[PDB]
Amino acid sequence: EILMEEIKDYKARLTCPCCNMRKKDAVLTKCFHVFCFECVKTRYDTRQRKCPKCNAAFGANDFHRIYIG
Amino acid sequence: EILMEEIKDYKARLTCPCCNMRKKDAVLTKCFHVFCFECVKTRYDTRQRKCPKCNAAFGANDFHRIYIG
Numbered sequence: 072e073i074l075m076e077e078i079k080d081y082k083a084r085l086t087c088p089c090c091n092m093r094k095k096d097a098v099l100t101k102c103f104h105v106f107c108f109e110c111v112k113t114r115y116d117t118r119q120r121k122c123p124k125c126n127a128a129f130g131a132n133d134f135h136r137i138y139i140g
Numbered sequence: 141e142i143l144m145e146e147i148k149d150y151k152a153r154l155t156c157p158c159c160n161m162r163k164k165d166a167v168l169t170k171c172f173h174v175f176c177f178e179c180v181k182t183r184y185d186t187r188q189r190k191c192p193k194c195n196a197a198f199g200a201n202d203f204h205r206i207y208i209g
């Protein structure tokens with residue numbers, strides 16, 4: 072139905088595109104791309120320290136939690 | 141209806157709480173609170189340079205666009 076497709080699109084817009092699973096709640100402050108915290112933190116801890124979207128490098132001070140909804 | 145209340149809640153979560161009107165697309169990087177760009181930029185240009193949520197001061201380098209959805 073039309074209402075449900077709209078719900079699905081909102082859910083997708085709030086969902087991390089990296090895992091397609093957890094909600095967006097983290098920002099990389101070099102490039103300002105948004106993901107879930109777990110995806111960014113696991114990349115940081117494993118030394119895969121590039122933005123999943125645009126490949127910009129980031130370090131310990133370059134990602135932080137945010138709260139959208 | 142139940143579907144419509146869920147849509148309304150998603151819309152609200154993506155909407156700037158300051159104007160309750162435009163979509164969230166800006167972050168203050170001192171405190172990491174999120175608003176629309178126009179609300180933050182108009183506060184900056186008028187020298188009302190405190191976070192609408194938590195009152196943290198911010199300057200020219202402390203707010204940037206982000207793209208959620």
Ligand SMILES: [Zn+2]
Nearest residue numbers: 087090107110
């Ligand atoms: Zn993720």
Ligand SMILES: [Zn+2]
Nearest residue numbers: 102104122125
């Ligand atoms: Zn990036």
Ligand SMILES: [Zn+2]
Nearest residue numbers: 156159176179
């Ligand atoms: Zn606003």
Ligand SMILES: [Zn+2]
Nearest residue numbers: 171173191194
């Ligand atoms: Zn704030």
